[PDB]
Symmetry: D3
Subunit: 147 residues, 6 copies
């Protein structure tokens, strides 16, 4: 049962979508026990988006730098988030398209039972379009995985 | 070029994610020229989710009841939104999973140039999990298409 | 190297597309050594579409009714043909859509060298759209496999 | 209701498959109201196949050069056409395959009602095989979208 | 670093493929620390293949009956295994195919470092073919996830 | 009906998995009438993996070096084998992942009736994970096709 106050998904998206506050929201979330990570990445290569998220997550401490387990949970949540952005073929430049994304990564227990342990959420928002500015529209993606 | 104040995607998601206001947000959006449609649908059949969205959209007037063109634009934006929720296989009950979604549909020009005309956005938020309550997590989806 | 006069794909289509009152193509192809099949199927169940094509291909003697080897060559040709039709998710009714198809099944060698042996093409044409007539547009798919 | 005499999909294919008439078929279709485009593309990069189809469409006046709306309709139609050719994975060279394609793009109204507006059809035809001539076979793809 | 002697994937397959020993291989693996599960499932519904694997896993104590965390790890591992069997579209009956599968589920740590924790491997083996015995062939699938 | 002693899939695996110091399987299979191939490949480019398998299958004489027909049977077997490995997106390096594979290619008839003719299996095994060693887990894939 998802805790009405700890919906890791909804929270990561609100953070990702609210431009006024930035450090005001991150602190509250962190004081609530959430490990937060924010970043931006524009590219026509998906592996750079994945790389960017993984690097920012490990630096901000959202996931462990050592070992595979946690990098593996993050990898798949990212894959699942890229689905919402790619909608069909997890390809960017190879299908003549590029993205400009903002991303958030949240870690913590979104459930009532403390036995559930930690979960992670990768949220993406920005644009996807042709190699030219202006010729694009919005795109969203959210992936949730257990750690 | 997307108008900083008319980002149809971001707006539909905020509406979808804000529980306090409900009719307070819809009115402002509608006074701004946006045609809005809200609804909920829980099911293990994707064709009922699609049906629910299409029916609510035509009743609330977001898209034209007559003709194919507009129903065709809505159909594909829905498909693109379901990708974010299904992340891989656009299947629910057949893969032993069910969803509980909240959906918003917005229509209007999100660009600076008035020549772009109308666009539509289908946003989904809720849960996806096993046929039992509690065993699920969050899921998001957003589709954007021109009309 | 393909035989400019035996491009099994191109031929199966020209045959599927033509709506001439006088039956002149089937006999011409057969006389040139080709096996030909023709059928129509409308359904919101992909398995029924695969079923019909198999059956008509066996009744017409395009593939052997005995064994698996040829039924296997056709099944994949059919599948690769349904991709052009479903474009992404090999689902019809569960995605609230339905088809009205016409199909051709051509079997024979399309190469200059007799060594390449027989090959088989499955072509599809019709409409795909909502459950209501009129609300739809065209759909095309060609699957080519070896036998 | 598709107009028996304006089946944009069927027409673009017949236009693509027939070698005898080249300007004779374009003219007749142009005089019938259709915007028409024809091209050839050989590549192992999907983005080049996409870019040529867009560039040819914008140079022949099948879709506007200015704005995003029309480029967006064509992009998706191309994607839907790319499906029938790739059959499963929208990759060519990365999967050790290359294509030699002939394409067509048709823009006009295929319905009885004028309220349906214009639609665009992207059609593809040619060979898909290994990076060696002769080692291949035929491949089709038809995409259809509303503008 | 995978531990040469604890390659959970390789083990579950060898365990799945060998008919001579049944309890002799389960015991040895159990005495080596591995949680093990074995089952058989014949169906044309993917959800039944999934449900049997989950039910068998929860009854044999390979994953907890309480909570979501472990069911979530197993669900995804099963999906990843379902991939190798469906090869492209996660559908069976809807695509006129049915399977007769033997499965295995292994839970334990395959790495040198104990900080990697437990991982779960779902393995599938059997036939996938038409709804008629004999008309089919072999099919494999191995899914691997972290708990 | 498959021959309990000639299940080409099951055999190709047992052969791929075994790491015995004494070469005893290859010769036994060959003596029973099977064509066998063995190779290893590590790369973050799927085309290089397909390349190697083709080549080793031609050098070993598992499929004819001349023609297309057999190269076509193998290419698809390979593809259907890569699905078990990529589980969703037939991408390695562009999704920031890489493989370390071992592959077997068995060719021969696996059915009781000699009428089914020859068939070919492509089996894969190794690891898939980040560009850094250790950060990975196992991966499996079996593709079976007719020839
Ligand atoms: N609209 C495309 C992106 C794009 C390519 N060209 C123009 N726009 C998408 O859905 O990703
Ligand atoms: N977690 C699954 C849903 C589910 C099935 N069983 C339990 N949960 C998903 O990503 O859709
Ligand atoms: N146009 C959709 C089908 C559809 C459903 N409703 C209307 N049309 C397709 O491309 O398959
Ligand atoms: N014919 C393959 C392509 C190929 C590459 N090499 C041989 N064939 C296809 O379906 O795309
Ligand atoms: N062998 C097919 C299934 C099938 C159905 N009928 C014949 N064959 C597959 O790859 O799934
Ligand atoms: N584990 C991923 C690959 C990966 C990338 N980084 C770490 N692992 C897979 O299933 O392919
Ligand atoms: Ba996909
Ligand atoms: Ba898919
Ligand atoms: Ba697919
Ligand atoms: Ba092929
Ligand atoms: Ba788009
Ligand atoms: Ba796909
Ligand atoms: Ba459509
Ligand atoms: Ba999940
Ligand atoms: Ba798929
Ligand atoms: Ba993994
Ligand atoms: Ba896929
Ligand atoms: Ba098969």
């Amino acid at each position: 049962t998802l805790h009405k106050e700890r919906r890791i998904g909804r929270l990561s998206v609100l953070l990702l979508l609210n431009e006024a506050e930035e450090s005001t929201q991150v602190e509250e979330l962190e004081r609530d026990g959430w490990k937060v990570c924010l970043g931006k990445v524009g590219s026509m290569d998906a592996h750079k988006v994945i790389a960017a998220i993984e690097t920012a997550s490990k630096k901000s401490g959202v996931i462990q730098s050592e070992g595979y387990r946690e990098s593996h949970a993050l990898y798949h949540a990212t894959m699942e988030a890229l689905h919402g952005v790619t909608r069909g073929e997890m390809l960017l430049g190879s299908l003549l398209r590029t993205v400009g994304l903002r991303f958030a990564v949240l870690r913590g227990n979104p459930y009532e039972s403390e036995a559930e342990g930690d979960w992670i959420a990768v949220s993406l928002y920005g644009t996807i379009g042709a190699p030219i500015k202006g010729l694009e529209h919005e795109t969203f993606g959210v992936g949730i995985n257990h750690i």
